[PDB]
Amino acid sequence: ETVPVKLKPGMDGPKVKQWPLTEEKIKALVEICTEMEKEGKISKIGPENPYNTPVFAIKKKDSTKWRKLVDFRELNKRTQDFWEVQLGIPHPAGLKKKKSVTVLDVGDAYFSVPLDEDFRKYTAFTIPSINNETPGIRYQYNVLPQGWKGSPAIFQSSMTKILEPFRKQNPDIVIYQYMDDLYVGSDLEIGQHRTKIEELRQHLLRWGLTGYELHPDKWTVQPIVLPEKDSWTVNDIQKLVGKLNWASQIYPGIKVRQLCKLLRGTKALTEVIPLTEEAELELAENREILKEPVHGVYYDPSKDLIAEIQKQGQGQWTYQIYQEPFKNLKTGKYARHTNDVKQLTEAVQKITTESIVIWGKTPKFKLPIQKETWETWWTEYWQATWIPEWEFVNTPPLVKLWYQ
Amino acid sequence: NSPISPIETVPVKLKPGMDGPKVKQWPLTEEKIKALVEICTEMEKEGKISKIGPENPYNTPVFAIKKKDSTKWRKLVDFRELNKRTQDFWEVQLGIPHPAGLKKKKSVTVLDVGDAYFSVPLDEDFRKYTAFTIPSINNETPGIRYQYNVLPQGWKGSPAIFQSSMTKILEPFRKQNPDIVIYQYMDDLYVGSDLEIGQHRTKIEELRQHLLRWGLTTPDKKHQKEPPFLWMGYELHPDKWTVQPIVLPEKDSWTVNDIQKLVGKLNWASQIYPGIKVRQLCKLLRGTKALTEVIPLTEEAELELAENREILKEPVHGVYYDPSKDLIAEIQKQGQGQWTYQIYQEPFKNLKTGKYARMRGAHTNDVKQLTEAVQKITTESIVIWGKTPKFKLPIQKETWETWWTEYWQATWIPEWEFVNTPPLVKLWYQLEKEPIVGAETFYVDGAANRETKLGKAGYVTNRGRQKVVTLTDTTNQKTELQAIYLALQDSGLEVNIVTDSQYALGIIQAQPDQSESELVNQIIEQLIKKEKVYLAWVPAHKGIGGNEQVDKLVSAGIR
Ligand SMILES: N#Cc1cc(Cl)cc(Oc2cc(Cl)cc(OCC(=O)Nc3ccc(S(N)(=O)=O)cc3Cl)c2)c1
């Protein structure tokens, strides 16, 4: 029997354009799809289905088989009510406290279960052709698709059974399902951990479904770092109150007057100045306030999460996740044949998966890059099975240094 | 007449919430009613339409117009209402083939399908909504009443369902001929293979046959067209291609209409003729009076059109595509944010060409544009060939490396090589990383009043110098830039500058070399002239050394 699915009212199905794909990715998808057609997973469809959802080919960390990856960003928004406030999957707060988290692809699970016939149409997708030789090859799903948030929503109750024996036997283990993946965290020694996971893949294995190691407790701050130095220059002070100036607004108590008074009248930037004792009382005060969590800022579950990212050059990238601008939930850096787009890709994935472990939802990314470039290039490096939402921005001049 | 394919049918539907059309038939003249009656009885004889009683409640207007010249009448059906009630269909095609993406084939033949829509059936429970009525003389007699069985012209689903139906039919013939290319465009098929006339003409026959088993008729040899196929604006010879004759009007006085047409034509000429330029011409269009209004040619515009004329003397053609070789794309800076490109496979034998202009933003420099163009071309290559080209660009690997590295925005170009084809792409000034010992620090500020729209711009330096200019229709933004300009005019070869405007900081920090703003351009010449310039930012309204001082200076009277 099929759990019938409803669209969020008045609004209706996704009609997203399909991106041009290169010949190799097209072939790989033709292959993949011919095969899942033979297995009854998808079916050719007719003109009379006006829906569409983009499709791409990716790789995934070590592998030489292409994977199919369908972008259901649209669809997921149009079904937010079904998968989120109707079949919601509760995020366990404990997950972030474990010493190790392993991520397992559980996506092959969904192909067991058939999809409510009156919903299949919303899953339409198209394999394009080159130079428009031929019409795309259109298809839709007969089963729960990878990448649609409804799939684990529905599959939830079978997943509970698969794991019941294993949960019973390791009650200090946290397993959380987000989209196509399982998150498993334990406080065990690294050997016993890799062992428990080995053991958990047999339970999975007995039911069809057939890796990735995170360390969340060892995720620590990115403190807005001010310099330590002998011989402070006019400029350095300017920079200093600059950075400091902006640290207040989010950091409660940051003060500058002492520091500020240092520079008075109209003097050369290179002029060296002596740092009066009262000034150092701020540096210090500031320094300590500056290493700590914010105070005032709490995850509100009803609000969207934002992430902004800045290029710091020589292969490093800073970022901040927040809900109200400035009210920082988390800040971080990411560091690295590796170009900008490749790097920006790695970071987006890494922030997204942290964000998944911590809040059980993914951020909308502000991306310091031209749409078109990003859109043409992102899949060469993408490996995740989900896709976060993103927009394109023009990193402010100063935001860069202040998080430097 | 025109067989109606055995194939299965496409279950059409109407929009949720909506029933079929019920629109009143306007009273027609006798000749019109007659003509319609001849037409409708003929179509009915051929299976195209069918009689129904007045029990069916739906109706769609019919008309009949005669003809400019000949004496045959046409039936017209106003499908506006049914169209607005029919479900949406899938976007038929998304992109048309480009000649330069056409694989070079030994032989190709064109097969247009005769009476396309009429050769394919219509979902049975949908015929009913296609009801129309030939009326009688005046009112009296109930009209004659019909409904479609095939795909009606002018109905929303016809292009889609036809295309779908032709896909289904082609499938199995593709299967047992994987090495034969069949382009589907609308109601044409274009077929090419790498075989000697012999088994070509045969294979095509075998196709024609396969189609007919399926109710679709196509011309025989003798009726199929001969190359050069004039298709979709293009000319398609067996070993090259080109755009059809472009001929540029010689007139005393150009109307806006005359210029729009020209730009269209030159634009269309650009995909194979290199060097084509269009900016002097487009500028004329900005602001424009009537369509029938004469715009005098600018001197710079006369200069553009003339250069274009010399390109178009003597035709240029382009070649076809060989998938076993790479694509090379070469780009050249033509000038005023104008860029020109060529794709080829074998050196100087071009597949196509183009230009790029599109001002991305308000201020930019050549490295940014150069890379915008690479983006644009990369994308165009995926669409056409299914792969990106190897680039050859008039920018040194070092210029490029400096810029990508030090710039805040993420950047990437595919595979590229330098090529020494002036003008070379270069950055025209760098700012310092550190303040210039023994150079004068100017502190700059600007302020404007939100009502009067008046403003003051000035500076005070660390050598006692000072200045304040007044400005009459400004904004804060303009005053802040003005301030920085001032500071550059009176500053001599090495200045340190400090501002509280993130705005100007941003602009200048991106090494603009062109701008929409005269002021930003003035700033650019200064900066280029300078030897060392360092620029720095402080927050405002936190009494800071020089800043507190200019702030009050430029405030006086403004705020
Ligand atoms: N879109 C489109 C479109 C539109 C129309 Cl009207 C026709 C069309 O046919 C094609 C199809 C293909 Cl697979 C390649 C191609 O051009 C390159 C080529 O090799 N041509 C070519 C080769 C031999 C001859 S002969 N000796 O048979 O006359 C004629 C020609 Cl054109 C042209 C494509």
A255 touches chain B (CB under 8 A): no
With H, G, I as helix, E, B as strand and everything else as coil, classify residue A301. Answer: coil
Q: What is the DSSP letter of B128?
A: G
Same domain, B29 and B126: yes
Ligand 1 centroid to residue B270 C-alpha, Å: 22
Q: How far apart (Å, rounded) are the C-alpha atoms in residues B158 and A391?
A: 38
Q: Is the CB of B227 within 6 Å of ligand 1?
A: yes
Q: How far apart (Å, rounded) are the C-alpha atoms in residues B191 and B166?
A: 14
Domains and CATH numbers, chain A: 1-85+111-151 (3.10.10.10), 86-110+152-216 (3.30.70.270), 217-321 (3.30.70.270), 322-402 (3.30.70.270)
A247 touches chain B (CB under 8 A): no
Same domain, B187 and B140: no
Q: What end-to-end distance do the CA atoms of chain A give, in Å?
A: 56
Among residues 269-308 of chain A, which lie with CB inside 8 Å of chain B?
Answer: 269-270
Q: How far apart (Å, rounded) are the C-alpha atoms in residues B370 and B234?
A: 29
Q: Could you tell me if residue B475 is inside a domain?
A: yes
Element housing B259 (H / E): helix B256-269
Between β-strands B441-448 and B455-461, what pairing exists: parallel, antiparallel or unpaired? antiparallel
Radius of gyration of chain B (CA): 34
Q: Could you tell me if residue B316 is inside a domain?
A: yes
CATH (domain of B298)? 3.30.70.270
Same domain, B113 and B128: no
Same domain, B392 and B441: no
CATH (domain of B443)? 3.30.420.10
With H, G, I as helix, E, B as strand and everything else as coil, classify residue A107. Answer: helix
Q: Could you tell me if residue B150 is inside a domain?
A: yes
Residue B522, classified by CB atoms within 10 Å of its CB into exposed (0-12), middle (13-18) or buried (19+), is: middle
With H, G, I as helix, E, B as strand and everything else as coil, classify residue A80. Answer: helix
Q: Which of A206, A186, A181 is nearest to A197 (CA)?
A: A186
Q: Could you tell me if residue B532 is inside a domain?
A: yes
Residue contact B387–A377, C-beta within 8 A? no
Same domain, B379 and B316: no
Per the structure, the count of domains in chain B is 5
Which residue does chain B place closest to A255, by CA atoms? B542
Q: Could you tell me if residue B559 is inside a domain?
A: no
A131 touches chain B (CB under 8 A): yes
Q: Assess whether the previous peptide bond of B6 is cis (omega < 30° from 0).
A: no
Inter-CA distances, B296 with B259, B267, B310, B396, Å: 11, 21, 22, 42
CATH (domain of B2)? 3.10.10.10
Q: Could you tell me if residue B256 is inside a domain?
A: yes
Q: What end-to-end distance do the CA atoms of chain B give, in Å?
A: 86
Structure tokens, B8: 């299965």
Q: Is the CB of B533 within 6 Å of ligand 1?
A: no
Q: End of a domain among B299, B321, B343?
A: B321
* Encoded amino acid at B462, one letter: N
Same domain, B151 and B276: no
Resolution (A): 2.7
Q: End of a domain among B392, B412, B428?
A: B428
Bridge partners, residue B184, by sequence: B189
Enclosing domain of residue B113 = 93-117+159-227
Q: How far apart (Å, rounded) are the C-alpha atoms in residues B312 and A161?
A: 75
Structure tokens, A322: 């927040």
Residue contact A20–B379, C-beta within 8 A? yes
Q: Is the CB of B530 within 6 Å of ligand 1?
A: no
Q: How far apart (Å, rounded) are the C-alpha atoms in residues A379 and A24?
A: 13
Structure tokens, A387: 């896709």
Q: Could you tell me if residue B194 is inside a domain?
A: yes
Q: Assess whether the previous peptide bond of B389 is cis (omega < 30° from 0).
A: no
DSSP string for B29-74: PHHHHHHHHHHHHHHHHHTSEEE--TTS--BB-EEEE--SSSS--E
Q: Which of B395, B285, B273, B414 is nearest to B340 (CA)?
A: B273
Same domain, B106 and B207: yes
Q: Which of B385, B382, B373, B384 is nearest to B416 (CA)?
A: B373
| CB within 8 Å of B80: residues ≥ 6 apart | none
What distance in Å separates residue B535's CA from the closest CA in chain A? 11
CA atoms within 13 A of residue A28's CA, in its CB half-sphere: 16
Q: Which of B263, B262, B196, B271 is nearest to B235 (CA)?
A: B271
Of A18, A136, A398, the CB nearest to B502: A398
* Encoded amino acid at A272, one letter: V
Atom of ligand 1 nearest to the CA of B237: 31
Between β-strands A364-367 and A306-313, what pairing exists: parallel, antiparallel or unpaired? parallel
Q: End of a domain among B158, B173, B207?
A: B158
Same domain, B3 and B87: yes
**Which of chain A's residues have a Cβ under 8 Å away from the Cβ of B410?**
311, 340-341, 343-344, 367-369, 373-374
To test the contact with chain A by mutation, choose from B9, B89, B90 the residue with the greatest count of A C-beta atoms within 10 A, namely B90
Same domain, B238 and B186: no
Place of tokens 């990115």: A222
Residue contact B89–A256, C-beta within 8 A? no
Residue contact B412–A267, C-beta within 8 A? no
Same domain, B330 and B307: no
What distance in Å separates residue B250's CA from the closest CA in chain A? 37
Q: How far apart (Å, rounded) are the C-alpha atoms in residues B395 and B443?
A: 36
Structure tokens, A247: 């640290």
* Encoded amino acid at B234, one letter: Y
With H, G, I as helix, E, B as strand and everything else as coil, classify residue B204. Answer: helix
Q: Could you tell me if residue B290 is inside a domain?
A: yes
Residue A202, classified by CB atoms within 10 Å of its CB into exposed (0-12), middle (13-18) or buried (19+), is: exposed
Q: Which of B511, B372, B494, B374 is nearest to B441 (CA)?
A: B494
Q: Is residue A8 within 8 Å of A80, Cβ to Cβ?
A: yes
Q: Which of A183, A188, A393, A385 is nearest to A306 (CA)?
A: A393
Same domain, B236 and B288: yes
Q: Is the CB of B192 within 6 Å of ligand 1?
A: yes
| CB within 8 Å of B226: residues ≥ 6 apart | none
Residue A337, classified by CB atoms within 10 Å of its CB into exposed (0-12), middle (13-18) or buried (19+), is: exposed
* Encoded amino acid at B314, one letter: E
Same domain, B70 and B147: yes
Q: Is the CB of B455 within 6 Å of ligand 1?
A: no
Q: Is the CB of B105 within 6 Å of ligand 1?
A: yes
Q: How far apart (Å, rounded) are the C-alpha atoms in residues A391 and A366?
A: 5
With H, G, I as helix, E, B as strand and everything else as coil, classify residue B444. Answer: strand
Among residues 344-403 of chain A, which lie with CB inside 8 Å of chain B?
Answer: 344, 367-370, 372-374, 376-377, 394-398, 400
Is B187 annotated to bind ligand?
A: yes
Is B188 annotated to bind ligand?
A: yes
Residue contact B410–A22, C-beta within 8 A? no
Q: What is the DSSP letter of B103?
A: B
